[PDB]
Design a protein around this ligand. Structure first.
Ligand code: PEB
Ligand code: PEB
Ligand code: PEB
Ligand code: PEB
Ligand code: PEB
Ligand code: PEB
Ligand code: PEB
Ligand code: PEB
Ligand code: PEB
Ligand code: PEB
Ligand code: PEB
Ligand code: PEB
Ligand code: PEB
Ligand code: PUB
Lengths: 56, 177, 164, 257, 177, 164, 177, 164
């Protein structure tokens, strides 16, 4: 895994049509590639709710 | 246009492409049972942030030695790098559901994960135990047999796609086995 | 101009010979390829202003540090020059499709572009990040044929492996 | 419109009669206003002949130090005779036959276009200026050591592969059984042997190159004869690919040698 | 050097403009007749050794003084040099036919040739009849009207190149005399 | 030996680079002719032992001055070796239809032919008779197709334009 | 020099016989994937910037002593001339691919490299480690399984194409042994 | 290599004459800087171990985007390599200011430098932030006399006029 391709991932969004069997122009779908971040914020509330200090 | 979809991921720099109201009919004519398929992959990415939280915590709940000092879920930046990686499989196996094939899952994500994890000190038997939670979590969302939340779909069967994603998580499991 | 017509007459001129029929096979390959190459250039002549604006927005998205002072994007007049610097490439990519060879590219835009970019402190890392965004989000059945989406996209990465 | 009319200027060439005029007045009226650009493009190409002979000596003097390639002297005052022999023969080659005049021109406008590897700006200069193409060849073919003084043999057979082609290359020197003035040793009472005494010094110390200087010159000479003589002659390329001194002693110009 | 495809963009480079469907259709018809263009230069190279040996005696059949003593064309060498002079200015017009542009002969053969013929005393009143003789043989080959040679070609008209081949011949004598 | 695609790569290292995008346009064109020309090689292949003796005595029907002594055509085994000399000119003209270009022609049919036919006094006009004797009877809709019928003669008259 | 079209004419010069319907069928199948061979060099010229780049870093990250004091690629006079040593063997292999044989490669460049490399002191032992870094990335771009750059091709089998490029690089180690 | 001695000893041999008395005047000028330049060599040789840090930290303050993931400094080990990188350039100014010329730099430092930076994507404008920081740091009262301040500061300005 190189330095450029590391924690890179697709990301996709879904807006379905509004009513069944009718064509909807608002329905749209992303397929944007996006680097997944480190996410330190919920890392703190998951380690503290389960075990001990985590301060090595 | 799946080959043009595959070039958004494989081209080693981030682009963007999106599908309007005209070419959504191009996708339904292309992919078989795509109204069952796009309902399925929407029901994984909408609840993936809860899905990564129960996956790492059940690994703690049946093996609490990871959060011990000297463990691999100690020193919380190291615990955050599990939570980074835990959706990276679910970002890519959702993409394996979208393309209908796990070729792009293999070389970009699974290739080299076995030798990386023994280089860093990852316990591999907990790593199959983390992904087997996410194998059981996706089929409760595709079949909508999840206990806590439920989603809204048009009625029918989706057990072929539930078996199709079950043939994708063991590719993650046997790569790091 | 390095076109296929010039390369087979320059070897014909150097040998002191006539046009032999071995070169005539290569001219037959043009009129088969010319229809699947000109409409890559005809669609580029009607889309150039919309593609050159959409290219440079990923130049500043991948490297947003150029807006700092001392860099190459601190004021508006040279960000305007950045779009002109990259429009001149995507005009010479249009020019080389009509010729068929790489003639206008490696002579006008390329030859001498190394020793002026490091001279004026311009990185080529942001130059290749402008066209690689252009070369990627372009669906080969949606805009043109399955052949022009091969041949024209073979001209855009010719810049990247000559600049890097 | 500018005025009441627009007549042509009297400074334009070819404006007078030249029908039944004297010889003095005929020649004055055909070269009326053409003398300036003939002398503009005469100092133009002579400066081009002075400019590329400088740009190849920069390889001969890398980063401000002289190599073993310059070596114009070996004994006390061993460049004074080399000073005369290089500049007296340059007049001897300016009184050549009128057949060799354009033979020099059209062949210099042949090999330079080959060596200028597909740069359209460069071939446009070589067609207008014949002095530039005479200087483009002998500068580059001495920058990359390819002509005669540096491609020494390494086997025992290659001394006759040299000797087979060169005395057959000197079919170009002797027209028939007479000699020519283009191949003259010298014209002073010592200048014959004074050309020899430097000719063994320049071959000897040029056989003392580095390991990089011989291994990079043994492939540059091979592709040189592979795009100057054997354009498709694969038998001649079968000796030009593995035996580079064969691919180097043969000279691309009609040098009358 | 500068062929037909390079010509149409070098007069459009000073436009600082793109090349769209205004003049590409004139170039799309150039590649339409390209099969007929390869069906034109084949008729010139196939009969080279006759038509160069033709005019060297067809010149002197009109002017017998060229074989007289004190002639330009008098000896064996001055004729042997004349015949090898003879197909150079016809192999270059074949280059202009195969590449569609006259920018290969007027820079490598008409590049000061009236300069050199004055330096040798080569006559010019003979050198333009010696190429006009070799001109009508070039329109009697691309249009199959030769009386001793027939090339089997499909049904179609060849006045497209009949004036155009002679356009690569009248520029020859004009800029060497 | 110069064919369609060994020439354009002999010029591709002559500048010191890779194949271009027009370098591949040349290799498409012999593929447009690797069916229309390989039928013309097959027509010579299964008929060559009929045409060696057909056009062989054709030239002997021209020149009666070879039939008396004072020539190298006195006895029988010279005329047997003459029919050998026919077979070499059909061996390599069959080769050029396989590779597309004038490769095998210029090496051992065109270059060097002056010495061993003029110092050996075997006249080149006697050779061009039997060369044209194959060329003056191409039955275009019978022996081959219409496109093989025009390019088979285009290789036949190459020794015409060279040797005579 | 000579192509795969001429490779049966290599044998046919020494037959005292011809090539007809006995050997055209081996050349007829070469045309049937003649689009494929021109489609499988378009990947090799598409990544010219990286293939000589990651190759020379592939030996640094394994044998790093070559840039140590006492190295062959110590200063920038040497290693900038190492990237020219490693690029022109990517050059004469792509000429051999369009020819179908190593007739361009084995005589223009590799005809006796063991009098230009042992005459310099070049390390032959990690030159072949610098070969299979490019071979393993040549077969990886023939297939569309490169984990970074995906390429849009027409579907089909190219194992005969992937095995051929490994059989070009094998004799490179033979030319230095 | 370039120095006062080896430059002027070349033209004696390359013109084929003896050692003159003008080249004898040239080494006399090397004596006037021998006790004037070599004090800076022993200065920095006992001083680099703290200025390899503060001039290695100097460029990343200007360019914090090198430590960003993706580019040439996206590894704590790349920056371990990056500090070793800058300890080769002024490792040669200890070799350049001990000899008297730019010999250890024009043959070991700049020769091939722009070609290993374009291919391996190292931005040359960060070396302009690396050792020219020491040019803006140098104190002629405190650190060393104004003879090093005219000669050590000169050899640095040779390099920025070379890596640009
Ligand atoms: C582009 C594709 C891509 C992937 C496929 C993933 C894969 C991946 N994971 C980690 C890196 C890591 N992955 C883990 C995860 C774990 N360790 C454990 O013991 C648990 C079992 C598990 C959490 C559930 C940890 C802890 C690290 C950091 C290692 C360390 O800091 O020592 C790295 C770090 C090395 C690098 O940056 O190259 C990569 C590539 N990330 C990506 O960017
Ligand atoms: C771009 C966004 C986009 C989507 C997300 C889907 C959403 C979607 N699915 C269906 C329609 C359907 N969706 C499902 C799927 C399911 N039903 C189940 O019982 C399973 C639990 C679940 C599969 C996991 C089925 C079975 C149908 C009906 C058959 C079909 O049309 O495919 C319909 C048609 C509804 C109607 O007739 O009005 C729509 C809009 N389609 C889209 O265009
Ligand atoms: C301390 C001990 C501890 C555990 C043992 C686990 C508990 C746990 N839950 C699930 C199982 C699951 N987990 C989810 C995930 C979710 N459900 C939702 O509705 C949300 C959107 C999302 C985050 C809460 C789903 C959908 C299932 C399957 C159905 C279910 O059991 O609820 C599984 C996998 C199936 C299995 O048991 O094999 C496990 C191991 N979590 C813990 O903390
Ligand atoms: C001549 C050269 C040339 C190209 C290479 C393409 C490139 C290109 N694409 C788009 C425009 C677009 N490009 C895409 C991307 C895609 N579209 C899809 O259907 C897929 C999801 C994905 C390709 C696989 C989308 C979705 C748009 C429309 C903008 C949007 O809705 O977001 C535009 C702007 C035009 C507009 O306003 O829409 C351009 C220049 N077009 C050209 O004229
Ligand atoms: C014939 C073809 C042709 C070209 C390829 C360009 C090449 C080019 N660019 C610039 C000049 C420039 N080019 C850029 C462009 C950029 N800098 C950035 O921040 C980005 C990396 C990039 C835009 C995406 C900038 C900012 C300048 C101004 C630099 C300066 O003048 O100091 C100059 C100097 C003269 C001038 O400013 O006009 C030249 C010759 N010009 C041409 O005529
Ligand atoms: C019979 C034909 C015929 C001509 C074509 C002109 C040619 C011509 N032009 C100028 C002279 C000139 N011609 C131009 C014209 C131009 N310079 C430019 O920048 C533009 C490219 C272009 C017009 C748009 C200019 C600017 C001068 C300069 C006058 C001066 O030097 O003061 C002169 C010298 C002055 C003179 O003799 O009067 C001549 C002979 N005269 C003729 O008799
Ligand atoms: C007096 C007239 C005159 C010329 C015509 C040029 C001709 C020329 N160009 C280069 C040198 C060069 N010339 C070019 C130009 C080109 N190479 C390419 O790849 C492009 C296809 C083409 C431009 C269209 C390049 C890129 C170099 C540098 C590389 C080299 O040395 O070959 C050199 C050698 C420079 C040296 O020795 O240091 C010379 C003599 N120079 C002159 O002084
Ligand atoms: C008194 C001296 C004298 C000659 C020696 C001949 C020579 C000759 N032939 C042609 C004219 C020609 N010459 C040829 C050439 C050839 N024809 C063929 O069928 C062969 C393929 C090829 C010879 C190998 C052709 C095709 C023409 C045009 C048709 C014709 O008039 O014959 C012309 C041009 C007439 C003109 O000026 O318009 C001349 C001078 N005619 C003469 O008046
Ligand atoms: C590699 C070598 C090579 C060639 C020599 C040509 C051979 C050639 N010529 C034509 C085809 C043709 N050639 C001619 C030309 C002529 N008809 C006349 O009446 C005039 C005498 C002459 C004008 C110069 C015409 C008119 C056609 C028909 C096609 C068209 O009209 O566009 C065709 C198409 C017909 C077919 O497919 O069978 C081909 C393959 N092409 C090649 O690839
Ligand atoms: C030892 C190296 C060597 C060379 C590089 C060439 C160089 C060369 N070529 C020719 C002379 C020639 N050289 C060729 C070239 C060829 N002839 C063919 O049949 C091939 C296709 C092609 C490559 C062999 C031709 C056709 C001539 C005759 C035309 C002329 O004299 O210029 C001559 C003078 C005549 C003679 O050979 O006595 C010389 C020195 N010859 C050599 O002996
Ligand atoms: C591979 C090249 C190749 C050829 C070109 C032919 C050439 C050829 N044709 C004939 C044989 C013949 N050739 C003709 C001539 C013709 N027939 C017609 O329908 C037309 C009017 C005219 C073609 C222009 C006729 C009529 C015969 C048979 C009867 C005869 O004339 O003897 C023969 C004698 C052997 C036989 O009986 O067939 C040969 C060698 N054969 C070959 O192997
Ligand atoms: C035409 C055929 C042809 C070749 C096959 C190559 C072969 C080749 N390599 C070098 C020369 C060299 N080649 C290398 C390359 C390497 N040394 C190593 O330790 C690594 C294994 C490898 C880089 C990965 C180095 C370091 C030099 C010496 C550079 C120097 O002389 O300063 C030389 C002498 C100088 C030169 O020309 O570069 C030659 C002929 N070059 C050619 O012209
Ligand atoms: C002038 C420039 C030029 C090119 C760039 C290539 C471009 C190219 N590639 C293919 C066509 C193809 N290319 C491949 C090759 C592959 N497909 C895969 O999935 C594998 C990854 C890879 C094997 C290595 C296949 C399988 C075909 C279809 C043709 C066939 O199956 O034989 C075709 C034929 C399509 C058609 O004619 O309509 C063309 C023109 N050819 C050219 O003439
Ligand atoms: C046209 C007939 C002709 C010549 C050739 C020269 C030959 C020549 N070079 C000289 C002398 C000389 N030669 C060189 C090197 C050489 N010179 C260069 O310009 C470059 C680039 C060189 C290496 C290739 C140097 C460096 C000198 C010393 C003069 C100097 O440059 O300061 C000297 C003086 C020797 C002496 O002092 O006794 C002569 C006579 N003179 C002529 O009349």
């Amino acid at each position: 895994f190189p330095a450029r391709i590391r924690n890179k991932a697709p990301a996709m969004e879904f807006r379905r049509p509004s009513f069944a069997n009718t064509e909807d122009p608002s329905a749209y779908f992303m397929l944007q590639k996006e680097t997944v971040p480190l996410r330190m914020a919920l890392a703190e509330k998951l380690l503290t709710k389960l075990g001990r200090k985590g301060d090595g | 246009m799946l080959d043009a979809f595959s070039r958004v991921v494989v081209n080693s720099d981030a682009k963007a492409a999106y599908v309007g109201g005209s070419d959504l009919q191009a996708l339904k004519s292309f992919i078989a049972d795509g109204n069952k398929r796009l309902d399925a992959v929407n029901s994984i990415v909408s609840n993936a942030s809860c899905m990564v939280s129960d996956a790492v915590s059940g690994m703690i709940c049946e093996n609490p030695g990871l959060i011990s000092p000297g463990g691999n879920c100690y020193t919380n930046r190291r615990m955050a790098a599990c939570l980074r990686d835990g959706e990276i499989i679910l970002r890519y196996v959702s993409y394996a559901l979208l393309a209908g094939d796990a070729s792009v899952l293999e070389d970009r994500c699974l290739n080299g994960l076995k030798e990386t994890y023994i280089a860093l000190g990852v316990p591999t038997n907990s790593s199959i135990r983390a992904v087997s939670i996410m194998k059981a979590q996706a089929v409760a969302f595709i079949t909508n047999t999840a206990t806590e939340r439920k989603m809204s779909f048009a009625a029918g069967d989706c057990t072929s796609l539930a078996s199709e994603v079950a043939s994708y998580f063991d590719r993650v499991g046997a790569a790091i086995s | 101009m390095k076109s296929v017509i010039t390369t087979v007459v320059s070897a014909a001129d150097a040998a002191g010979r006539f046009p032999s029929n071995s070169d005539l096979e290569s001219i037959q390959g043009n009129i088969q390829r010319s229809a699947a190459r000109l409409e890559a250039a005809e669609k580029l002549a009607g889309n150039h202003e919309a593609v050159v604006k959409e290219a440079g927005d990923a130049c500043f998205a991948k490297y947003a540090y150029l807006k700092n002072p001392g860099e190459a994007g601190e004021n508006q007049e040279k960000i305007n020059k950045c779009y002109r610097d990259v429009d001149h490439y995507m005009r010479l990519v249009n020019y080389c499709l009509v010729v068929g060879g790489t003639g206008p590219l490696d002579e006008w835009g390329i030859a001498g572009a190394r020793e002026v970019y490091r001279t004026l402190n311009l990185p080529t890392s942001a130059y290749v990040a402008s066209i690689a965004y252009t070369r990627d989000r372009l669906c080969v059945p949606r805009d043109m044929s399955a052949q022009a989406g091969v041949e024209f996209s073979a001209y855009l990465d010719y810049l990247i492996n000559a600049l890097s | 419109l500018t005025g009441y009319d627009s007549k042509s200027s009297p400074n334009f060439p070819n404006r007078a009669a030249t029908r039944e005029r004297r010889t003095v007045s005929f020649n004055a009226r055909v070269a009326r206003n053409k003398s300036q650009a003939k002398k503009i493009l005469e100092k133009a190409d002579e400066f081009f002949a002075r400019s590329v002979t400088m740009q190849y000596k920069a390889f001969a003097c890398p980063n401000g130090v002289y190599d073993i390639q310059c070596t114009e002297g070996t004994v006390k005052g061993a460049a004074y005779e080399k000073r005369a022999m290089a500049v007296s023969a340059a007049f001897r080659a300016k009184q050549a036959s009128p057949a060799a005049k354009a033979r020099a021109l059209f062949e210099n406008r042949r090999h330079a276009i080959i060596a200028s590897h597909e740069c359209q700006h460069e071939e446009d200069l070589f067609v207008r200026f014949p002095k530039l193409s005479a200087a483009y060849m002998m500068g580059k073919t001495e920058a990359m050591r390819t002509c005669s003084r540096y491609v020494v043999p390494d086997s025992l057979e290659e001394e006759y592969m040299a000797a087979s082609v060169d005395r057959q290359m000197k079919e170009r020197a002797c027209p028939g059984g007479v000699y020519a003035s283009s191949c003259v040793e010298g014209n002073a009472k010592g200048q014959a042997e004074q050309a020899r005494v430097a000719a063994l010094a320049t071959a000897f110390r040029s056989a003392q190159k580095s390991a990089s200087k011989t291994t990079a010159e043994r492939y540059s000479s091979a592709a040189y004869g592979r795009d100057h003589f054997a354009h498709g002659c694969s038998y001649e390329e079968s000796v030009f690919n593995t035996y580079p001194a064969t691919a180097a002693a043969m000279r691309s110009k009609s040098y009358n040698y």
